[PDB]
Design a protein around this motif. Sequence first.
Motif: not given
Ligand SMILES: Cc1ncc(COP(=O)(O)O)c(C=O)c1O
Lengths: 409, 406
Positions: A74-76, A289-291, B108-110, B131-136, B216-221, B246-250
């Motif tokens: 997963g994440y690095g 950034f996530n890498g 999404a982080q970037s 609260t989700f850390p990234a936003y704040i 609106f963050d739909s990363a978990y949709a 949104s994201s392909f991450s999860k």
């Molecule tokens: C609330 C939220 N949004 C978005 C993301 C996706 O982040 P990334 O696309 O940078 O992995 C995650 C992953 O932790 C998350 O928990």
Amino acid sequence: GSTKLVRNVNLEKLKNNYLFPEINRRELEHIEKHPNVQLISLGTGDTTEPIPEQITSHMSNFAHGLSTVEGYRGYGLEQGNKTLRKAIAETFYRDLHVKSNEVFVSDGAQSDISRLQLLLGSNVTIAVQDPTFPAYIDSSVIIGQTGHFHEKTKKYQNVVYMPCGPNNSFFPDLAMTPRTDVIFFCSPNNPTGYVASRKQLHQLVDFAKTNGSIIIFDSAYAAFIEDGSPRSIYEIPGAREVAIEVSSFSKFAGFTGVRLGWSIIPDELLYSNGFPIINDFHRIVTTSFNGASNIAQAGGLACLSSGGLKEIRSVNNYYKENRKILMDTLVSLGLKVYGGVNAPYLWVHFKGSKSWDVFNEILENTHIITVPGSGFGPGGEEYLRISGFGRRDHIVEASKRLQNFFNTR
Amino acid sequence: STKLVRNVNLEKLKNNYLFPEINRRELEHIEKHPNVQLISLGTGDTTEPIPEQITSHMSNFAHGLSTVEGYRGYGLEQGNKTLRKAIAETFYRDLHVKSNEVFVSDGAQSDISRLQLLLGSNVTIAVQDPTFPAYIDSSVIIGQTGHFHEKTKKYQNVVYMPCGPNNSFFPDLAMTPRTDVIFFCSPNNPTGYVASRKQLHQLVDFAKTNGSIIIFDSAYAAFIEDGSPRSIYEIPGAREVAIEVSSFSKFAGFTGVRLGWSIIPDELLYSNGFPIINDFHRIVTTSFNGASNIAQAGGLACLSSGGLKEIRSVNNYYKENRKILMDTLVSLGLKVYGGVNAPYLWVHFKGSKSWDVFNEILENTHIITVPGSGFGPGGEEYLRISGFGRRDHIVEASKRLQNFFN
Ligand SMILES: Cc1ncc(COP(=O)(O)O)c(C=O)c1O
Ligand SMILES: Cc1ncc(COP(=O)(O)O)c(C=O)c1O
């Protein structure tokens, strides 16, 4: 239906750059109007030869490994794989006291530059070279470091522009350059192709030390240097106390679409108050950034094996031979040609002419695309940037056509 | 030394200790009790491999970069057109999202930090609490806040909107002061709650009435199993107030591959009538050179009917894990929220500090969880627990919790 959100002021300040959108529109139009004649481009600075199979193969294998339990991750580390950081340190900074933990792997310089600007913030003053690389100045405006764009001078207010041209051997006159918090310096330069000398870099580091400034030094073109001029600013003793270096696999190895670079933030680089800047760049990286992509990072590592470096050097010798064809052509026609030796760009002076009129002449009469120096600011007026990327038969044909054209004229 | 003054926004930013601390406590515990297998239900990283179908496309595209026919340098910073069309068709079918309103990111982080660069320092924001850390964190860095008020555990100048069981994890709009921007994550991290169609309607109207925008963050949709909405553009008029991220991450396990997107509708306008989309284009051009071409190939393969089938199947494995955990925890009398529409369970221990429950569970069962406290004051008294992970770890942890809570 409108909203009440107020447009970020920094967007109102930022002038659009029409340069490349125009080049591209004119290229298409000209291809459409003369389907008769192969258009050739010596303009955009994208690499064109494929990446060696040895490097790519490591990227394909790593990717397949992601479908296995033994290879899936997963994440690095946001900072980047340790193997890759040690390799960048050893390959590019051997004996320069750069630690693997001072290397921050990026998805390339464009992003890295914007992350540095986020680190620095709105309340600093910057110096850039003129002619000017867009990324440094645009990122500076967006984060809030500048006033409006002064139309008459073609310079943003609150920014020091440092002329670099043939008259000062492409290095600013430091004795007449006002002090700033930050100095951006690109060597080998885009657009001029000049690589600063050891003596010039010494002076820049001393100027910085004396002014308490930091240098952001962009070495993305270092691999093109053939002189024995320095490749990293950390070749200068004490650079580590004033300079951050930014670089890329983009032009070095053709990773322009793959996305990989790095920055160096030395241990010893301190703010006013003695706090290491590196600690805060870590927090900027963690937050924004996530890498870099894992697959790109595997490719990067393969670039830095002795086998990878040998294959890449060989593609870059092809480009080197192309530049020579072009520099020998243009010099034989009496043109003042700068750059070319240590960078993939030639910087050709047409004293008395507007960059755009020369572009038009060359496009209309030879069906060749170049880049108007005007596009890089007022210190680019009267020049064209010309690229040695491309295929050999195109360089050779372009050489033939320029010969014919300028012997008219 | 240098004369550079430290960015004030960095002085404002408190370190979040949460994950580094969970991590330190884990290592310390493994070190004192090396004779036991520690198990983690803490971190929310995906753990099953990406299907070979998808990966194979990434390998082929990569080998194609060593050929004249397949070599590709810079792409559109916004992302490949084929990928944008597929995101539009896959996730926003019939919602009037155009391929040119999709901005492909390296996740999404970037993307969030680039949205915050777009917005600037001179805006006010609302975030959910917990609260989700990234936003704040991104808000503080860019300059949108004052300092962190230690007593309230809130950054000054930020509206925190409590979301908990008492208000079905949806903010009470009568007690929510107006902001320029509202961040809303659904399905939520950390609570796992997915807002309903009716709640989203109200939020869109609240935003219209206040002239706010919603991020609106739909990363978990993709984890939604109800028939709750997956995108905010299911709500008519959302397109005039909302940006979706949104994201392909999860969704597909691309956490390390790095790929996501944002949607900026045509119709989203500033004060002065200028489309916001024009300026995000300029932010993207200036601060980004595109997601990796290899990752974009992987993304496109995710959204083939074959890709989606295979991804759905990895997500069923996780769905079965969550069921093991939920059935265990609930069968023991714990109050479990979330879990259904997200990979996270949000477990309430009324009367206890998050950290003391963490301590208890760690000492007696050698299991790591996430203290809800870490996500702000609305997380106090809860733990977040993850259903990612290998089945045999879920099972063993379930066994140990059974023994402990009996
Ligand atoms: C609330 C939220 N949004 C978005 C993301 C996706 O982040 P990334 O696309 O940078 O992995 C995650 C992953 O932790 C998350 O928990
Ligand atoms: C001056 C300069 N720096 C750095 C880069 C590298 O940019 P990236 O790594 O974002 O491709 C380039 C590419 O054109 C450039 O011209």
